[PDB]
Symmetry: D2
Subunit: 404 residues, 4 copies
Amino acid sequence: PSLEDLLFYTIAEGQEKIPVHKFITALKSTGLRTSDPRLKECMDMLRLTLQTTSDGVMLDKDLFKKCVQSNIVLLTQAFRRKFVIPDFMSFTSHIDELYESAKKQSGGKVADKFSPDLWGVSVCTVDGQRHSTGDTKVPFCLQSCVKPLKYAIAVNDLGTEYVHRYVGKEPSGLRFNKLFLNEDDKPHNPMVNAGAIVVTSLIKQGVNNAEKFDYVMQFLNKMAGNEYVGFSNATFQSERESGDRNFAIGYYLKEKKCFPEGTDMVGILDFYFQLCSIEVTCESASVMAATLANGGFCPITGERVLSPEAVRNTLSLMHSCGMYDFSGQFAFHVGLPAKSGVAGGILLVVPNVMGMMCWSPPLDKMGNSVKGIHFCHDLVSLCNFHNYDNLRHFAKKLDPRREG
Amino acid sequence: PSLEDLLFYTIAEGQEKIPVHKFITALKSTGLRTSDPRLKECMDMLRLTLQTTSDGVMLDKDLFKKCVQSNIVLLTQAFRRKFVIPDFMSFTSHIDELYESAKKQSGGKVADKFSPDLWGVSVCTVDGQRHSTGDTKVPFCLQSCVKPLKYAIAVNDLGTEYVHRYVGKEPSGLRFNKLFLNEDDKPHNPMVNAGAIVVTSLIKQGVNNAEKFDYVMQFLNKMAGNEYVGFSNATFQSERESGDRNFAIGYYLKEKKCFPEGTDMVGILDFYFQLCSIEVTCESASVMAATLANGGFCPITGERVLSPEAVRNTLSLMHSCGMYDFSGQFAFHVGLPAKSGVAGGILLVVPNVMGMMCWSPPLDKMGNSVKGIHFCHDLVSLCNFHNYDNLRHFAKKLDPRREG
Amino acid sequence: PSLEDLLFYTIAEGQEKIPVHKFITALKSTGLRTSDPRLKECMDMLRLTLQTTSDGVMLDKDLFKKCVQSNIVLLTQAFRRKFVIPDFMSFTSHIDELYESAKKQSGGKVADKFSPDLWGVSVCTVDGQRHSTGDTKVPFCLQSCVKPLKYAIAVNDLGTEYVHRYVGKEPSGLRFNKLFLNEDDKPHNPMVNAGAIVVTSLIKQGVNNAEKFDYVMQFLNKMAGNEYVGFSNATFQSERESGDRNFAIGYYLKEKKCFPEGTDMVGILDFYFQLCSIEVTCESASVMAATLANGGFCPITGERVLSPEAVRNTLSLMHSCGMYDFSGQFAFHVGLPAKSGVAGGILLVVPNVMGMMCWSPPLDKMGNSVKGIHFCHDLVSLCNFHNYDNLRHFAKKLDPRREG
Amino acid sequence: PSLEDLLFYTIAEGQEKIPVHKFITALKSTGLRTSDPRLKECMDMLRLTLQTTSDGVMLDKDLFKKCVQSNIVLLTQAFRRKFVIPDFMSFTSHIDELYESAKKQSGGKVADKFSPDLWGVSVCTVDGQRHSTGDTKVPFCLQSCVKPLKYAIAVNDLGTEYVHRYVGKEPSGLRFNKLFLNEDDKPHNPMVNAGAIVVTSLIKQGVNNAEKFDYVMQFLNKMAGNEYVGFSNATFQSERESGDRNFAIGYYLKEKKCFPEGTDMVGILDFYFQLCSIEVTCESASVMAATLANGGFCPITGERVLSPEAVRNTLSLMHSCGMYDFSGQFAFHVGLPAKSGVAGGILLVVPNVMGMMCWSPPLDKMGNSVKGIHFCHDLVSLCNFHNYDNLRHFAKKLDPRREG
Ligand SMILES: O=C(Cc1ccccc1)Nc1nnc(NC2CCN(c3nnc(NC(=O)Cc4ccccc4)s3)CC2)s1
Ligand SMILES: O=C(Cc1ccccc1)Nc1nnc(NC2CCN(c3nnc(NC(=O)Cc4ccccc4)s3)CC2)s1
């Protein structure tokens, strides 16, 4: 028995000692990055023993074991390739190829502000492995990408039954999106502005709007492994000064008695416009994506955020309702819960595998980003990620969950 | 190396002989039934050597070794619990459990002539394991349960592009449950009578309703591993006596030129009413369902009935379009590709696991077996088969893909 | 006392005699044609006394009088200007102008078979007065101009109450061009093919379709004062081999139990196809209009064809449901109960004044004669015939019911 | 020649003087009211000459002459029975008969605060004749009865075509009591809250909401010959707190840029609710009804309030878009342009005859006054007033424009 030192020999070719860069690149290549929270101890003790000399440094089998003792369990499976993507290093080189192939899709137009050449993809597997290519550190607002996230919080806190005494669950229709309420005098489902507004009103009833936004922020922090979540006051005041269509939905719901008892209607939209201006980066948000890919458990902190009840329902509804009018075709050709917003954002989710976020600000005639859409077609072109692809017989596709 | 030897003292607890019945009881336990067609070489050579006596009797390691030499490769994984559901024997206790609960469900009306207290459930898994409780050998007609099966057949010959020149992919909306076409003047999706009637028009073009029907009985024969795929001539006389509405759908489609050039609209309804009266049993139809579970390869034969393109698209559309108006709620609360039929049938698929078929002739108001539906809420309640359940963190549900 | 003498001097120069050519042109100017059936006795007894002489003839006080005694009261009204239009002579010169400017309206496609330059108008007041300009004696088919007339027959024989157990009375709304039934499973109104078809099932249930057609033709004779009503077997069967849309409606109404029991659905369609192919001309159909403009009484025979009950409902429903999708605009700018026909027909009715029929085969985007459409707009642009024009304060429009 | 003399010998029995209190009942016989404003000079000059006595007393040929010298032209017609309804005395009994038969229908509920047994009916003919039985002097609010009047004021100022850039001219469809705009992003007609609100947005554009109201209040007073057109500030303060539905409409309208340039969406709604709060009595409002029966001229004054273009369009749209969802059924069985509101009122117009107002506060289940609705059926069953009743042959109904 000797678990920590079995990885020393695995990195030290039956050898004297190893430099630390040789451990660092043999850890940067496992997908993981030196920044993983679950890796903090081990990474701390390397910041320590590097200052031990001004040497290499170079690690003993006991000096090594002293840093990796802490996180040894998720360290072995990284170097014993027990991650849901074993060969993470090649699978990035196609993400880069799918990125540059999609880089030339020129058509589209922004809404009305960013510059129309920006284009980033970022990836986070249900285990931690990360990759980014292109402009993945530039912030943008979620906008409607938040609609799944706040729906989860709501059923997380209330339960399916209560949450669905006020909103329905099926998709609208392709020329039935102009309506607000369904036959039961409830909104169609929580991915349309009509039902997203009734769900924004169930979140912590009895408390006020300053406090409520914190509560969401602390949920959304947990889902993103405490990576970047921000807030444009800018796009907030634009959102509440052009949201005429949204005030419309507001008053209709007040009269048809669709809000819970004693809901300051105007308080609730004010909140909603805030929620849409929350900022993220590509990298920030792929973690949020991967929290849903992972049953309500953040992949880079192991902290459980979302009841599974909540994760199931949010994914069922991103499937049918998440691309606006394109979701029926999306759920057909790509067949992945996804959620686009008008920023260029697609909160792609590959259940039990990984999580993504794409960003090109040029949008198409339906409200989806041009390069964003194209990408997902080429991604499920290549690998058997479509929800009803077979994991055993998948013809000429590539399953990154296997090796060789 | 001794692969046929490896299994001898795996059934023979270090003993020298094995009673044949102790081996086959060790095989009935695997779920497989002694009549598997990938097992017949082994079964033929078993009855050969067992008439080389008539006393007991037993098999030595030299004798067992050329019975099961034939189909060792899958006889190994049967006995090495390398099948999708390893402890198949306790899973069936729950299928019995939920069966006997759904028996007490008394409501529903029979359509119109069967007896109301009929009720049977049958499983076949992606590897071939079978179970059947209750009345699962009485035969009924698929009715609309045929509508996915023909859709696949079209795409496996014509391709996804051509076939969706002629029938959309979205679901309609409980408001559009009695419009026929969509904005682009195609029917909404192949699971509604209007869409059925147009896919039937694309099969085996240039050929008459005799060879056409036979080419769909043969194809359905492949899918079911050559189990009972029959035909009621009785139904097809009165489905055409009282099919006033379907003549309504057919002429409207002809008016709008929804068929490929040169389609006998009256004959295609004839073909269609035929396909609706193909008989199956619970038992035979669960192999059809499991064939789609399994990448288009028939589990109990090994042959490749369907291209993977075609099994994928059938499963996409069953999900969203498969349960008349209950589709919306079914994809929420049960989240499985299912399909319902006016006679009590539910052709249920659990992709990459298994394939079911339930049957109780009393429907509810919406057209789905009362006992049928009840059962499928309970099956997802107990087990993590919901399409968007999590395969690692699934709360207190039972995963049958696991041991322990 | 001597009313027949009063006419003698009122036409003669207070002189001599009367020449007869100046009696008939004194009569042709009052509107009436020598053909009027209320004038045959008069017309007869002059066709006699002019086989007497071989020169003039000129009638004396006594000879004049015995021709006109039998229709003295009708013939006094013409020359004492007690007709609904007194100065018919000038009213027609405007009809020619309105027909002339409408001559040069360019576009339009004829449906598919005639010639695109055909154009005639014909008019007949509630009192018998007739005018026609252009191609007014070429036969064409009513097509959907027939739907009011058979509605009239049905309610006249069965009553408002019974009839409207099977068809509704409101219009549909412009998005509902494509539905067949209102919410109560009844076709919206009797001017859409679905309600028409149901009207024709009520017309003398229980008698065969050879006898049924005779009845209608008899009724359609009583309405044209026994002028030209024909039937082209040529369009009747081209309307049969292309009526795909109508068989659609047929079966839908069969299935929804929208006919009286005993109705042979397919028979009723042939009846309907028959009626659509009835031939009329501009001239002969302007009298049928005038029968309805006249409270049930044919204006050239004084017979009571239709109960008033039946005449009221037909003009109600023509008003709102009469011009396909254009009825809303037509009922606004024109405001006369009309009914268009794909042949080029418009069956106009100015109640208590006159009936007309226009014909040019070029139709517009909505299926309504191009020159036909333009003419009405102009005619009501010039006379205060709009249903909600005032008869006292009508600004700059011309009232033909008043002299000077 | 003896203009004024002629009517002295008419009322006095070839006798000396005529007692004045019987000339006044000779004039109350004619339906006219001694307070008729076209009769003030006659009534003043008459007040003089009886205080030039304190006698009985009576009137000579020359004392009668310089009293009615003034308004002889309508005093002659009032006694020569040249009014629209010659035997007004008998007519009023059937108004009482139809009144107290409508008084026993106990059905209905008020909305919310009045008393359910208020029942008031008031008639004004296009000549000025008046009658009023029951609670015809109790004030209530126009409510939607405002929409026609508001529409006319619009079109009389800006003309058909401008006003119909911002509102169409068709009814809805019983299903589309719900949608706001139509296929051209305009509200349907101006008789539903959607178009009423936009119509409001075109009265005196640019001027603020204080002059706007006083502009339509000076316009309603003209239309009612300066009888009681009040304003309940009470209901307005409530109509503005429960008007959630109307706020929904307004915001949606701002979204689709359906108002004209520079419209303050929120002041326009305030204006609207004011327009609904305007007060009238049965008697006050029955004179507005008559002003539209009279091509835009107030009967009891004689001024030209509305362009004829403006009152034709208004009467068109009340015909069809008049009584909410009953309007089609109303336009069938009653076929009279009418407008109902939530207060218990029906604004009835009988073109070229009279105008009316009914009032029972109990509405039925469609927003229309119960005793009101009953009365109007009774009245067209009684009299030939129906839009498409024939004026010559009208079977067993009564005609009040003919004597006997
Ligand atoms: O008009 C157009 C353009 C258009 C129209 C037609 C064709 C093509 C183009 N766009 C529109 N923008 N906003 C519109 N109105 C919404 C719908 C009405 N209200 C309602 N929302 N949901 C109801 N639903 C039930 O009230 C319950 C129910 C639904 C269906 C069936 C039965 C019951 S109303 C809320 C507002 S419309
Ligand atoms: O519904 C009721 C009674 C009802 C109504 C309301 C409430 C409750 C009860 N009866 C009916 N059952 N079926 C009806 N329609 C027929 C079948 C489908 N139709 C059509 N097929 N495709 C269209 N669509 C485009 O042709 C393209 C298009 C789509 C949307 C908008 C514009 C254009 S209609 C053609 C006729 S009617």
